[PDB]
Design a protein around this ligand. Structure first.
Ligand code: YMX
Length: 287
């Protein structure tokens, strides 16, 4: 089951950032010799969060693929609680897309090594890699339920992995709609059946992948940024389609549309989506 780790073996360097979960730190783990790792700490860690911690750790232990952030274990001595991960140096995929879009170079400075917007090849490589993670999850009849670029990570070499299972959801982010009470839904990434009746399936994940493609080729824009969430619920539910992004080739748009068929069983399978993206990333390798 869940590998445990001794607090003494975890040395915190510095905060990488904060979230709903809590802080994430760069750290040095020992005995895995001497190693660089990401450590997510728990903000509250009282009761509900203490057993949602149980869940995530068990889940992350379960999953093992080159496109899922690797998990090493936890540390339950004292407080607050910690999860330990491999280190992805370029952070979340959403911020990475936006900062490396058509004003990466046109707005750089000192701490700016090798700017220039991301090209077609790089975008496809990001897309194919997120697909692969998802092919894997579909294979285990696993349903993510919150696939979006904010829950992917980027590591050195444009290595992109799925890194979070939306276990902690930002109460204050427009990316989420409070259905009622404490339940937050990422409605802009969800299809009609999920928005109306919370039917989550591998076919609702493929829809969300479609939307991830859209985020990728708009360089990180929020789907339906023009709309508030209630307006967006009405469009999505009425059958409205996001526009082909400026940077998006027609063939990539046709894939998005295959992920967005209205009837779930008519959506393209993630496996076929993955293959078709890989073919496209192949055919552009040398241009
Ligand atoms: C250009 N800059 C470069 C530096 N930078 C970074 C870099 C790395 C992280 C970070 O925590 N990385 C993680 N590595 N492994 C994780 C596992 C797990 C996690 C948790 C997680 C998973 C995920 F899929 C998305 C996340 F935002 C956070 C992180 C790492 C990092 N952390 C913040 C990213 C934004 O959210 C707050 C923390 C920032 C910012 C951009």
């Amino acid at each position: 089951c869940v590998h445990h780790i001794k607090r003494r073996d975890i040395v915190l360097k510095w905060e990488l950032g904060e979230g709903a979960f809590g802080k994430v730190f760069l750290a040095e783990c020992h005995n895995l010799d001497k190693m660089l790792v990401a450590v997510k700490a728990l903000k509250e860690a009282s009761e509900s969060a203490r057993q949602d911690f149980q869940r995530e750790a068990e889940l992350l232990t379960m999953l093992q693929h080159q496109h899922i952030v690797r998990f090493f274990g936890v540390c339950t001595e004292g407080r607050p609680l910690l999860m330990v991960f491999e280190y992805m140096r370029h952070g979340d995929l959403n911020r990475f897309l936006r900062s490396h879009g058509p004003d990466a170079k046109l707005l750089a400075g000192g701490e700016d090594v090798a700017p220039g917007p991301l090209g077609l090849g790089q975008l496809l490589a990001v897309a194919s890699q997120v697909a692969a993670g998802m092919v894997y999850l579909a294979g285990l009849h696993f349903v993510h339920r919150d696939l979006a670029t904010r829950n992917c990570l980027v590591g050195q070499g444009l290595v992109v992995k799925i890194g979070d299972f939306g276990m902690s959801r930002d109460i204050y982010s427009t990316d989420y709609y409070r259905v009622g009470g404490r339940t937050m839904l990422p409605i802009r990434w969800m299809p009609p059946e999920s928005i109306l009746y919370r039917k989550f399936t591998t076919e609702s994940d493929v829809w969300s992948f479609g939307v991830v493609l859209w985020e990728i080729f708009t360089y990180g824009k929020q789907p339906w940024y023009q709309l508030s969430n209630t307006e967006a619920i009405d469009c999505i539910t009425q059958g409205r389609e996001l526009e082909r992004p400026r940077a998006c080739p027609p063939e990539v748009y046709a894939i998005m549309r295959g992920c967005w068929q209205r009837e779930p069983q008519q959506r393209h399978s993630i496996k076929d989506v993955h293959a078709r993206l890989q073919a496209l990333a192949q055919a552009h390798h040398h241009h």
